[PDB]
Design a protein around this ligand. Structure first.
Ligand SMILES: COC(=O)c1ccccc1Oc1ccc(N)cc1
Ligand SMILES: *[C@@H]1O[C@H](CO)[C@@H](O)[C@H](O)[C@H]1NC(C)=O
Length: 344
């Protein structure tokens, strides 16, 4: 079990002003640390944030947090469930800022809600350094769905933070799961919500990406294929070719006729194209969403290689290609579940 710690700096808060926090399970025997970012959509104005506070309050407040949590998937300490890092120090950071982990604005007299996602990550890292992280050799920042996008937005800031604090020996890396989206046409009549959210949250994006797209076009950096080339920390990308959250924003809900068949096939081809210059990636041809913290994450394979194996090969590569231990795994067949190992 992972144990809850509320942030000692109570000014770094969830949406409603309650303190943010993290769940931790230590492993004194390891110098590897895994920090995982929870997902769960977002809210972008007063009215729909008010709605989210009524029926999704745990994503906006720490008031009702359970006092511990169970680690699953890549957060499991059992070798049978987690062949990759079962012996690592485990950290689960709850998502209570509703800002895709980008915000840096406090609750105040002008702001009904606080959006502090980027600052929550910074403060968790700082408080963990007095608690074991100062001796780490690798810090892997991971996350799923909105947390996967949060990895892309924050991994280089964590690297910069550790350098400025005096810890240049810690190798910061990222693992972005199911947060690699496309700003494509919908099947029937979404990027505007991101643009409005950024101004509502005072959201921040990586500096190298911001300099490319410049004022008021910062929404571009929320899309993986645009922000990834600007990052300097090593990042491993996991993405279903037919992601269910992507299809939902595209207004696709699953007899498929020719128009829909061509749309679905073109989406898989476009996603595959955006990953050709991404050396560390895992992209199976399945209709699903999220992967790395479910208990049976070991079952899916691309070209005969599991995701835990591909991540271990990634570790080895960062000590050119390795014999029988690949890191770039993208299916080429064109329809959902043409890979026999897709989840049911
Ligand atoms: C849950 O996370 C998101 O909603 C998200 C994150 C980053 C970028 C986009 C996002 O939603 C989308 C907006 C528009 C289109 N076309 C696709 C996806
Ligand atoms: C708490 O965090 C905020 C935001 O990062 C910072 O401005 C403040 O100085 C911190 N408080 C202390 C006591 O360090």
């Amino acid at each position: 079990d992972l144990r809850l710690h509320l942030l000692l700096n109570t000014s770094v808060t969830c949406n409603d002003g309650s303190p943010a926090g993290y769940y931790l399970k230590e492993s004194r025997g390891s110098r590897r640390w895994l920090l995982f970012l929870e997902g769960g959509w977002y809210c972008f104005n007063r009215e729909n944030c008010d709605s989210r506070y009524d029926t999704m309050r745990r994503l906006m407040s720490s008031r009702d947090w359970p006092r511990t949590r169970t680690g699953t998937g890549i957060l499991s300490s059992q070798p049978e469930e987690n062949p990759y890092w079962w012996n690592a120090n485990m950290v689960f950071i709850p998502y209570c800022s509703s800002d895709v982990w980008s915000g840096a604005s406090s609750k105040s007299e002008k702001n009904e809600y606080a959006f502090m996602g980027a600052l929550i990550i910074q403060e968790v890292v700082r408080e963990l350094l007095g608690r074991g992280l100062s001796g780490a050799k690798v810090l892997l920042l991971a996350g799923s769905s909105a947390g996967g996008t949060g990895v892309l937005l924050n991994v280089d800031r964590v690297a910069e933070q550790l350098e400025k604090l005096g810890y240049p020996a810690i190798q910061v890396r990222g693992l972005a799961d199911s947060g690699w989206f496309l700003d494509n046409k919908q099947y029937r009549h979404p990027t505007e919500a991101i643009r409005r959210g950024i101004r509502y949250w005072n959201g921040v994006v990586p500096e190298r990406c911001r300099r490319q797209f410049q004022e008021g076009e910062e929404w571009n950096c929320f899309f993986g294929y645009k922000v990834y080339p600007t990052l300097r920390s090593p990042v491993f990308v996991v993405q279903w070719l037919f992601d269910e959250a992507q299809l939902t924003v595209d207004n696709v809900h699953l007899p498929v006729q020719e128009g829909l068949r061509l749309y679905i096939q073109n989406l898989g081809r476009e996603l595959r194209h955006t990953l050709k210059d991404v050396p560390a990636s895992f992209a199976p041809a399945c209709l699903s969403h999220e992967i790395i913290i479910r208990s049976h994450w070991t079952d899916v394979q691309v070209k005969g290689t599991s995701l835990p194996r591909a991540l271990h090969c990634w570790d080895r590569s960062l000590h050119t290609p390795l014999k029988g231990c690949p890191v770039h795994l993208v299916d080429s067949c064109p329809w959902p579940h043409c890979n026999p190992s897709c989840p049911t």
